């Protein structure tokens, strides 16, 4: 259907700029971790895992959301709508468990600096990464593909499951449980760092950087997981759908915010970014 030109063009341009910045940042993070040989570690492997997750979030789901916004309605196939929702959930739920294992690794490193290489070894790190990716896949496409509501008869409609039975499970298994794990691990990290040398300081600095990243992610994605379950469990059903869109976009903004954090909070990452550009 016809829509605005100037406003739509401006909105599309700004959104495209956002995706371009996010993709550039994630690619920069991946290249900085990979090409450099002094940035190899299980923590940096988890960092590139998060970079891949939010790069997928910025490269496929984000452009589709931007195009939907510009058009005002769904234009692609219904199968494409389902795959779009599934990829959105998969990326936003794999990032959270990536942060969970990053928090576990940072707790191990802060608590046991000297013995850190003997606990979180390369093999164990990759095993944990693969387990996280598999569990994120399962949690993402279980409630959706498994318990799927009757399909709408309109090809132009691409909505979100509003049934409480799905929103409760998705919020619990995607945000609230991994979030609780992350808070437990970082409260432990904070207490251990404060109560507690050349390697301990490095672990503390990495923990601070990844804690900033985790805080940004949680702040960005909290409004959505607070408004969706509330909307389903209360007479108010996502009031001001505009605000519902704003909370999704704020959540997506973390995908672009994250690459800024690594240089601005880790001088090693700043040097790597400077010398890779
Ligand atoms: C991990 O976080 C999750 C993300 C999810 N994402 C989707 N999407 C994203 C895109 N999308 C929209 O409807 C959005 C929002 O609503 C709209 C309303 C009117 C106009 C446009 C709108 O754009 C369709 C599919 N679906 C789910 N079930 C999700 C579940 C999750 O777990 C709790």
Author numbering: 19 to 214, 261 to 341
The publication says:
Among them, the α1-adrenoceptor (α1AR) comprises 3 subtypes: α1AAR, α1BAR, and α1DAR, which mediate signal transduction via the activation of Gq/11 proteins. Antagonists targeting α1AR have been primarily utilized clinically for management of hypertension and benign prostatic hyperplasia (BPH). In this study, we determined the structures of α1AAR in complex with the α1AR-selective antagonist doxazosin and the α1AAR subtype–selective antagonist silodosin. The complex structures indicate that both doxazosin and silodosin bind to the orthosteric binding site of α1AAR.
Doxazosin is a selective α1AR antagonist that belongs to the quinazoline class of drugs. The structure of the doxazosin–α1AAR complex reveals that doxazosin adopts an inverted L-shaped conformation within the binding pocket of α1AAR, establishing extensive interactions with surrounding residues. Specifically, the dimethoxyquinazoline moiety of doxazosin inserts into the orthosteric site of α1AAR, forming hydrophobic contacts with multiple residues, including C1103.36, V1073.33, T1113.37, F2886.51, F2896.52, I1785.52, M2926.55, and Y1845.38. In addition to hydrophobic interactions, 3 key hydrogen bonds are observed: the oxygen atom of the dimethoxy group forms a hydrogen bond with S1885.42; the nitrogen atom in the pyrimidine ring forms a hydrogen bond with D1063.32; and the nitrogen atom in the amine group forms a hydrogen bond with Y1845.38. The other 2 moieties of doxazosin, the 1,4-benzodioxane-2-carbonyl and piperazine groups, are accommodated by α1AAR residues D1063.32, W1023.28, A1033.29, C17645.50, Q17745.51, F3127.39, K3097.36, F3087.35, Y3167.43, and F862.64, which are primarily located in TM2, TM3, and TM7. In contrast, doxazosin, with its more rigid quinazoline ring, appears to have a suboptimal fit in the pocket, resulting in its positioning more toward the receptor's outer region. In addition, van der Waals interactions involving residue E872.65 were observed only for silodosin and tamsulosin but absent in doxazosin-bound complex.
